Amino acid sequence: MSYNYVVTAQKPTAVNGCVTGHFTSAEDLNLLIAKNTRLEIYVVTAEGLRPVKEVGMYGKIAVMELFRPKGESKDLLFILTAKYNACILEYKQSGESIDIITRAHGNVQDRIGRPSETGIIGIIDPECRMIGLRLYDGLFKVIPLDRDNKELKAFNIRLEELHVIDVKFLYGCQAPTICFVYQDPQGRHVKTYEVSLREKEFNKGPWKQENVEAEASMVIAVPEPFGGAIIIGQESITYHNGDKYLAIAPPIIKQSTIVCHNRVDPNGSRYLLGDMEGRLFMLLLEKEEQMDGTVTLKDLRVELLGETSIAECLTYLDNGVVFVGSRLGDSQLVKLNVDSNEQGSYVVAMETFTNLGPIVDMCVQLVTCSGAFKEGSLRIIRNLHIRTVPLYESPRKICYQEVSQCFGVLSSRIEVQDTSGGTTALRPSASTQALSSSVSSSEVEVHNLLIIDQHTFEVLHAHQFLQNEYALSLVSCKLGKDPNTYFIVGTAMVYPEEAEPKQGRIVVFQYSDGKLQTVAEKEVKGAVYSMVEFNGKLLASINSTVRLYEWTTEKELRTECNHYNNIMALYLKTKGDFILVGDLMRSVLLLAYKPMEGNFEEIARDFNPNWMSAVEILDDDNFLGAENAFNLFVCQKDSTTDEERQHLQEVGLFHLGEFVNVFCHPTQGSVLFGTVNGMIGLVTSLSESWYNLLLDMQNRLNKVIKSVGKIEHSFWRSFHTERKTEPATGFIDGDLIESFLDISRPKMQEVVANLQYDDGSGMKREATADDLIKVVEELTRIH
Amino acid sequence: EPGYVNYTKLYYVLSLPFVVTDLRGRNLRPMREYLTVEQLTLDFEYVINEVIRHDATWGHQFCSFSDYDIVILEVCPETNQVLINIGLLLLAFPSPTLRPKTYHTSLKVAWDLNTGIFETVSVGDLTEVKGQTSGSVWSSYRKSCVDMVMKWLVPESSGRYVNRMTNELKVLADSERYTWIVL
Amino acid sequence: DFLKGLPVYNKSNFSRFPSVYLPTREYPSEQIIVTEKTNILLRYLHQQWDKKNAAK
Amino acid sequence: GRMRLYVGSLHFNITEDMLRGIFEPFGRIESIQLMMDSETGRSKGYGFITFSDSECAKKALEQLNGFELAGRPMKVGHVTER
Amino acid sequence: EHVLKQLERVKISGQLSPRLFRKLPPRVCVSLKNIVDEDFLYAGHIFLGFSKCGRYVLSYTSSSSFYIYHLYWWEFNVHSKLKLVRQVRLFQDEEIYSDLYLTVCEWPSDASKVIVFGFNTRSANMMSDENHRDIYVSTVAVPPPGRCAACQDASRAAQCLRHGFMLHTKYQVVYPFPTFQPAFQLKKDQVVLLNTSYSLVACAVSVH
Numbered sequence A: 001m002s003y004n005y006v007v008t009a010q011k012p013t014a015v016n017g018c019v020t021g022h023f024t025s026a027e028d029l030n031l032l033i034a035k036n037t038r039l040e041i042y043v044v045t046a047e048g049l050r051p052v053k054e055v056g057m058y059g060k061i062a063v064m065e066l067f068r069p070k071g072e073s074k075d076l077l078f079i080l081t082a083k084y085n086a087c088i089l090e091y092k093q094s095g096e097s098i099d100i101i102t103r104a105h106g107n108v109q110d111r112i113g114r115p116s117e118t119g120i121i122g123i124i125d126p127e128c129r130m131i132g133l134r135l136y137d138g139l140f141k142v143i144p145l146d147r148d149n150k151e152l153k154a155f156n157i158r159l160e161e162l163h164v165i166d167v168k169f170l171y172g173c174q175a176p177t178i179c180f181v182y183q184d185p186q187g188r189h190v191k192t193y194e195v196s197l198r199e200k201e202f203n204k205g206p207w208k209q210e211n212v213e214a215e216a217s218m219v220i221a222v223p224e225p226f227g228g229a230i231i232i233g234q235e236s237i238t239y240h241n242g243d244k245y246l247a248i249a250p251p252i253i254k255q256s257t258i259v260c261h262n263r264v265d266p267n268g269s270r271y272l273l274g275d276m277e278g279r280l281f282m283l284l285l286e287k288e289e290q291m292d293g294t295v296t297l298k299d300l301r302v303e304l305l306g307e308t309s310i311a312e313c314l315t316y317l318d319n320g321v322v323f324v325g326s327r328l329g330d331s332q333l334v335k336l337n338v339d340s341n342e343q344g345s346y347v348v349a350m351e352t353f354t355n356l357g358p359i360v361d362m363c364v365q366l367v368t369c370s371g372a373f374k375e376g377s378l379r380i381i382r383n384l385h386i387r388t389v390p391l392y393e394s395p396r397k398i399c400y401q402e403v404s405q406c407f408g409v410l411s412s413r414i415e416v417q418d419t420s421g422g423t424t425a426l427r428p429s430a431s432t433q434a435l436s437s438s439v440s441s442s443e444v445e446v447h448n449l450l451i452i453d454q455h456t457f458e459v460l461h462a463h464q465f466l467q468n469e470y471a472l473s474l475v476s477c478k479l480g481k482d483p484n485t486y487f488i489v490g491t492a493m494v495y496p497e498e499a500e501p502k503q504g505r506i507v508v509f510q511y512s513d514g515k516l517q518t519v520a521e522k523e524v525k526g527a528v529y530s531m532v533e534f535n536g537k538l539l540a541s542i543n544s545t546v547r548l549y550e551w552t553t554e555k556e557l558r559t560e561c562n563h564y565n566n567i568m569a570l571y572l573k574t575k576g577d578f579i580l581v582g583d584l585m586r587s588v589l590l591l592a593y594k595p596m597e598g599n600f601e602e603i604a605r606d607f608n609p610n611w612m613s614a615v616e617i618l619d620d621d622n623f624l625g626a627e628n629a630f631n632l633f634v635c636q637k638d639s640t641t642d643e644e645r646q647h648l649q650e651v652g653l654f655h656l657g658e659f660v661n662v663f664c665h666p667t668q669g670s671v672l673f674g675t676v677n678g679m680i681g682l683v684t685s686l687s688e689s690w691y692n693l694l695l696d697m698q699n700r701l702n703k704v705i706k707s708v709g710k711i712e713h714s715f716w717r718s719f720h721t722e723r724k725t726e727p728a729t730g731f732i733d734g735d736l737i738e739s740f741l742d743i744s745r746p747k748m749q750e751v752v753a754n755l756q757y758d759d760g761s762g763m764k765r766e767a768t769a770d771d772l773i774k775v776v777e778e779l780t781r782i783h
Numbered sequence B: 001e002p003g004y005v006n007y008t009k010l011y012y013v014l015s016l017p018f019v020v021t022d023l024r025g026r027n028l029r030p031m032r033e034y035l036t037v038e039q040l041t042l043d044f045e046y047v048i049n050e051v052i053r054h055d056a057t058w059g060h061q062f063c064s065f066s067d068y069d070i071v072i073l074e075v076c077p078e079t080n081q082v083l084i085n086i087g088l089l090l091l092a093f094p095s096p097t098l099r100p101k102t103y104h105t106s107l108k109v110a111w112d113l114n115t116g117i118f119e120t121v122s123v124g125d126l127t128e129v130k131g132q133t134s135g136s137v138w139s140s141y142r143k144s145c146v147d148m149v150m151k152w153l154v155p156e157s158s159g160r161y162v163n164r165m166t167n168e169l170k171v172l173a174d175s176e177r178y179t180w181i182v183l
Numbered sequence C: 001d002f003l004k005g006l007p008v009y010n011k012s013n014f015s016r017f018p019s020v021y022l023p024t025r026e027y028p029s030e031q032i033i034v035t036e037k038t039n040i041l042l043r044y045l046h047q048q049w050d051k052k053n054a055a056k
Numbered sequence D: 001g002r003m004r005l006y007v008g009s010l011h012f013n014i015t016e017d018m019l020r021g022i023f024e025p026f027g028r029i030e031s032i033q034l035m036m037d038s039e040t041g042r043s044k045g046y047g048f049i050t051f052s053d054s055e056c057a058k059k060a061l062e063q064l065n066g067f068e069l070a071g072r073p074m075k076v077g078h079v080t081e082r
Numbered sequence E: 001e002h003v004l005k006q007l008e009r010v011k012i013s014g015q016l017s018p019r020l021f022r023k024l025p026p027r028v029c030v031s032l033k034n035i036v037d038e039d040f041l042y043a044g045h046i047f048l049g050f051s052k053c054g055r056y057v058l059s060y061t062s063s064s065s066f067y068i069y070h071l072y073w074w075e076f077n078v079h080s081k082l083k084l085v086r087q088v089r090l091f092q093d094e095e096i097y098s099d100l101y102l103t104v105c106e107w108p109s110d111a112s113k114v115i116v117f118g119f120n121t122r123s124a125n126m127m128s129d130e131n132h133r134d135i136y137v138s139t140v141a142v143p144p145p146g147r148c149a150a151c152q153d154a155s156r157a158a159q160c161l162r163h164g165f166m167l168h169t170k171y172q173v174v175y176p177f178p179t180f181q182p183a184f185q186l187k188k189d190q191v192v193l194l195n196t197s198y199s200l201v202a203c204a205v206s207v208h
């Protein structure tokens, strides 16, 4: 049996959402930030953002909206988790005492219904009559907002439009009305429906359905006096309101997709628009006052303000200050000013907040390949101390070469196909600013192998791969009886005509005297997804085949053996003669290289359906897996008939709540992992007795520590997929047990009350608060 | 408790007839002292006569019914409710505006599996079958059942699909793992 | 320019320039959120036939 | 005599079992083959129904051709048989 | 959209689901001829497809005055040969004098059992009888996924009740012949709704 302990080294740093409003007091202007499971509460003060409290929710925050139903002196918070836990939260302060009250809570999941392509959408009616939720295709969930009833009986309304892109509740409506963009075989359309709480149905919307741009991706509900809706596309911006229909096709917006918006003015006169390239625009709604008192929208105008980090969300704060919530790069506080600078920009950065996400690869003290596109960087983490190395392009893979005192970094940069012959770069980056550079022999991605100095992180050399060649995998090792250490790169030919790679290369490089020399090339008939040093041989995975290569005295790669039983062999990890193969669609499998046989042997496979993200070998008998549903699992050789030995058993299950892209090596062992949200964690093994004590301690802590939104810890950490839900097993939440040191002394005594149990290799203890304090403190020293 | 419902329970270890066996051929041990077989029946004939008697406004003009066609419109596993549509060929006198005529109607009935108790949810209007054949009426009826299920069709998750396999096929696909067996 | 006159909630906010919440044993709730158990097709037919019953 | 019919202009979610239910009341059916896309993993919108009797297949066409099944007007016709 | 462009999106988004790889071609294509055991060439199996988990691939036999039906479970491993796991005799002690249109179904969440619905175009008696049709339905237990403690207890080459039982039933339907509705009939896990044209029967088989 396998017992594991998972703890957070670095909490998530990517910003998934941000809202402004009056949550703490009616007077306080608050900033609320969602960093996966984490909710950060701030007060906008003279000095900037004064932190109030950071609360960890037992769920991935999917909906975070402030609303004020009548009778409330302050805004209430609505939260929906990825596991469909819904809650209405109230902030309460009594002198120095701070409490987050759960006004209402419950799970709003449906057994029927398939999660929608554009994900969970949560909207609140301007007149706080109801909460609207788009969770599944074909259904619209409505939570009636009634305060004089024991339960908020939520119901589903059928939606004929099975593919909705975005939806919002409209302003200035006598009847609650939703406005949404949907897709069907005739294209994209904008439609409205009135919501009847009495009849539990939709009624004909205020204005006729209108046909829209093929890539119309977001709806903006414009407040009164304008009313109506703004629909943002790839090439156009339109306004719709019953009679009115305005359309602007500004060429400025054509190059990049607008992905976020934020209302500047309470009346919706100005909106901030953020695109994929990090550009910031101002959408202007020019008004016309009517003599009947009403105000009509006369024209729309967009103007480029400047550049910010690639924004996931934007929130205007106060006095021209805007918070840029970034997912792919560092978050910012930016200042808006009417006078342009040296480059003509109206945006000036005030503060920068480090974001490690997405950690797409890492090295070991810790060196990550962080961010993407212009936000691409390297991050050096030690005792936490963080150093950032800007690349201004996408880092893909990293490897350390001790003998060369340098790192090997695969990277990609975007170039544009122009009026002229070839393609040209849009921005200067690491691959175009190296000390020396080379090119291979025998919008688009240009792939490079970067040689970066281990001390200064200076880009010493940049080797550009062939036209349409993508570098996928990277290793630094010595092969065969050859004493030299090489940078080995696995590639694929990505053409603008085909879908699957049918060609690729394995290229052996040697770095000397500030330059990279091509030692050898080996043609493959597919994509070289992963490569690992394996007992002085090269283990590589080409499409669906795992292959072992020998390095000859002739400095050539000679294929030795192949294993063909894979769908997409994306991940490889080895320990001795054992190979752990991770499939994008077919779970994991264990192979063994048979030295006296010169071939592989399929030892055992995990027969469970799992879409893998990363794999790791804990020990000779325990294998760690991370999948697409944000769960961790541990496989073990079934401990007998040959068929029984050929079956890997999932003995450990745990809902992590993060997407793992890289695993790398009291408690035994230390496997560090990097995630999409920039969270860094540690997985370690426990003895049976250590696990038993820590598990009893978890159950005791859960009876004392309360959850915001009243989400059960056990429910949160339960292994969950669209196929099954099972309670977490063989896994200890290190974060929960560590929190014992942070609870008051009277609460510690109630946790350790009539606890002895502890079978430390034999017999029973008699546990006090001080016994466990010593236990938890030794555990905090693992990271 | 009701007369329209019939429930039978039988236990095993080594109305419809059951030839419960192992993988070889042994008919196991039929007793009530392990395997558990359950059989909850719903008599259409009773339901039809009950719904016409109490829930059809035209119930006074009804004479007798001929054939009937039962098409399931919905199965709710969370509430254990089966929504069945009952296609019906009957004989009835018309409105005072006699002479007995053949008509066709639809009876929507919700059937609870926990209680075994049915509930009537819709009584159709008596529509005349003027010189339409028996096949003409059942084809049009089923077409309306198809029409309704398609209208109310809400996509289900990946993991809750009822797999259906039959070969009289060019490829055998494993959708979730993008694997095909070419025949 | 149309960047002049940005919203001012308070001038005393940017002209100048977080603690973890561990909820202690304290639990006063108010309401619960529940989903309508009955099927949407059934609810609609129930709704339409009950309106036909009202048709006096 | 034995007659084969062409059924077309069908909604892609119309199943073989649905087609059987709609056509079976007219007479005995020897075979039904709804054409499927190997690459989509969904109906092509057309197929063939083979009645045991020619007069039974004639009445199925007379009563179903040009009439809407799930909003799409069904196209029921004859076939080569040569 | 190139598979590698799709895969890069995954690494920076953390959004990997099959309903995204929906439009791309199959990753692996293997011909039935290259994975089928040569001794089963003379047998003439009719391959039905994959079980919900990609582990098994099922097939049937319509062997012969009466017809005998058999259900097979083959272990699938992409290019490797199919390995026969389970062979069961469908519709026990039942003499079928006409070739059945059989369908093998699987419940939404219950992977323990499968249902085999076989029906003939029209019932008989020697002579074809136009007013009736025969429905044959069998509930078969699937092989154990791993090591089974109850299965280990055996006296001959076998399988416990949970991972080795079978259920059979036969019923006559009349005009209009009831519609086959497999998705609704098995919407509730472990229940089969069977329209016998005179009543709807709810059939629950469960091992404890």
Ligand SMILES: Cc1ccc(NS(=O)(=O)c2cccc(C#N)c2)c2[nH]cc(C#N)c12
Binding pocket: B071, B072, B142, B143, B145, B146, B149, D013, D014, D015, D017, D018, D019, D021, D022, E179, E180, E181, E182, E183, E184, E185
């Ligand atoms: C009216 C009707 C409904 C449903 C089915 N079959 S099903 O239960 O397998 C099903 C359920 C829902 C959607 C689909 C799909 N695509 C299939 C029918 N078979 C014959 C019918 C007739 N007349 C019929």
Ligand SMILES: [Zn+2]
Binding pocket: E144, E148, E149, E150, E151, E159, E160, E161, E162, E163, E164
């Ligand atoms: Zn068993």
